[PDB]
């Protein structure tokens, strides 16, 4: 019997219970967005998790929004371009978390978010 850890495995929602993603596995997730006609975008933050500083009413949390890296990559067809921007963000903010998100113009929402880099 093994005890589930209490520290050091804080999470970032979808895919964060998998082992750290390789570059080829990261490319496959990015391609999934492109195949699905969704727009990839990068997001970064020095704070990795949600908190409740300004209010505690139902459905209010701080720390859900991170900061946008540049703009959503509209019309992107090359998944390696997303990787190039990921590496750029890692260079400018080596102590920041970076996740990859996705937007759909059809259902008009954000529908993807998975962690791409931890400092």
């Amino acid at each position: 019997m093994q005890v589930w850890p209490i520290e050091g495995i804080k999470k970032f929602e979808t895919l964060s219970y998998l082992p750290p993603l390789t570059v080829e596995d990261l490319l496959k997730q990015i391609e999934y967005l492109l195949r699905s006609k969704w727009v990839p975008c990068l997001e970064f933050s020095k704070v990795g998790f949600v908190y409740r500083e300004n209010h505690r009413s139902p459905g209010y949390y701080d720390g859900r929004y991170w900061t946008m890296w540049k703009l959503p990559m509209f019309g992107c067809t090359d998944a390696t371009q997303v990787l190039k921007e990921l590496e750029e963000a890692k260079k400018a903010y080596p102590d920041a978390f970076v996740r990859i998100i996705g937007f759909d113009n059809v259902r008009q929402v954000q529908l993807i978010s998975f962690i791409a880099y931890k400092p």
Partner: protein, 431 residues
């Protein structure tokens, strides 16, 4: 045939349409049975108005292929018969009387065409699928829940203890059983307090937003609202209602409260099988599902034959659903931007069912693992981790282009190689 069988009537865009599965008594022609369904579910004082304006009319009858003495009767009800925003009155008007008519041996309401003109008088879901995902910051996978077992018998503290371990292992939600309201040995406010502590301890530990379906089902509307009020004070994200046993008048009141106060509303369909199980009599679940979307709810339990389920899943989630008899969709349903409801899958599922559930339902679903979490040999947190790992292994494989229908067992076995939690789960429950 009568003044109620009008086989060339052209439905109006404001009409509420109904598809009844009618089984006439011996010696009752289907034309006569269909006119009776329209009459018995609608209509000197008659000279003081125009009855043809207020009658339901059976505008089409067809046989059920493969069943003798079974027919589908289509009936059109004028818009003026229904009170705005009241599912209670829609049910009263359409199913309040006709199922007892002696000329009908059996009767089952299969579907309802809710016209946009009527549905726009309903608030609908307090939030719906897309708002809920944004509020909870969760994207790209089914959500995970777990009903606390035993139902009753635990202290309020031991109950919340189980919730914390479940949530900290990777589940998004834990759940009050539909039976858990307020009872001797676990009063509701005590449960709300300890479950609140479990919600926030697990959220601080993992970094992900957590919730617990706090059941507000009560004997009176006053008690029901009192329980939602305390959940609001505690700042938690979601409450719960048994909409069929509580009733539509109470459910619509609670849905209005949750909209006004930012609460997600998890809906359990307790007692539905009393009504929707038999093919020959009752009301199909898709009718009870449309009613819930109109009355208001953010989740609804949908079970776990597969084509019928996919049919009303689309009717619960999508904006526009084209007619499809193969999937039990008798009417084209236009919801004119009323938000959708997240279907909740439950029923003896475990890690090995994750490929099938992920492929069948897609991301916009909640998968509920009661015994599939609390039955893990290592406890609730490893059991949650096993379920969360199995799900994300399936999501990753689907996103990569893999076929969860033929590779599902291989995908689960592959994740067993690095997740001891999943490996232990897969050892007790078999493929």
């Amino acid at each position: 045939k009568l003044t109620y069988y009008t086989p060339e009537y052209e439905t109006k865009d404001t009409d509420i349409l109904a598809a009844f599965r009618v089984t006439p008594q011996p010696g009752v022609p289907p034309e006569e049975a269909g006119a009776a369904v329209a009459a018995e579910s609608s209509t000197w004082t008659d000279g003081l108005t125009s009855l043809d304006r207020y009658k339901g009319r059976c505008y089409h009858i067809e046989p059920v292929v493969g069943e003798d003495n079974q027919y589908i009767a289509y009936v059109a009800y004028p818009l003026d018969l229904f009170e705005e925003g009241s599912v209670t009155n829609m049910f009263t008007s359409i199913v309040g009387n006709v199922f007892g008519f002696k000329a009908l041996r059996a009767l089952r309401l299969e579907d309802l065409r809710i016209p946009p003109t009527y549905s726009k008088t309903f608030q609908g879901p307090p939030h719906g699928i897309q708002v809920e995902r944004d509020k909870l910051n969760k994207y790209g996978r089914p959500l995970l829940g777990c009903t606390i077992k035993p139902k009753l018998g635990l202290s309020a503290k031991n109950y919340g203890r189980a919730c914390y371990e479940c949530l900290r292992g990777g589940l998004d939600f834990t759940k009050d059983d539909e039976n858990v309201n307020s009872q001797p040995f676990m009063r509701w406010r005590d449960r709300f307090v300890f479950c609140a502590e479990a919600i926030y301890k697990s959220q601080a530990e993992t970094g992900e937003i957590k919730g617990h379906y706090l059941n507000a089902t009560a004997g009176t509307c006053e008690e029901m609202i009192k329980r939602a009020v305390f959940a609001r004070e505690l700042g938690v994200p979601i409450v719960m209602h048994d909409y069929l046993t509580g009733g539509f008048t109470a459910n619509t009141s609670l849905a209005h409260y949750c909209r006004d106060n930012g609460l997600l509303l998890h809906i359990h369909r307790a007692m539905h099988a009393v009504i929707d199980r038999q093919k020959n009599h009752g009301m199909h679940f898709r009718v009870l599902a449309k009613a819930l979307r109109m009355s208001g709810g953010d989740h609804i339990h949908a079970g776990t034959e597969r084509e019928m389920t996919l049919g009303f899943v689309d009717l619960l989630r999508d904006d526009f659903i084209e007619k499809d008899r193969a999937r039990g969709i008798f009417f084209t349903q236009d919801w004119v931007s009323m938000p959708g409801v997240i279907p909740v899958a439950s029923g003896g599922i475990h890690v090995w069912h994750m490929p099938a559930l992920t492929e069948i339902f897609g991301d916009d679903s909640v998968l509920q693992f009661g015994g599939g979490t609390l039955g893990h040999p290592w406890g609730n947190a490893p059991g949650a981790a096993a379920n969360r790992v199995a799900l994300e292994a399936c999501v990753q494989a689907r996103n990569e282009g893999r076929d969860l229908a033929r590779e599902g067992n291989e995908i689960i076995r592959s994740a067993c190689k690095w997740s001891p939690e999943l490996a232990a789960a897969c050892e007790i429950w078999k493929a």
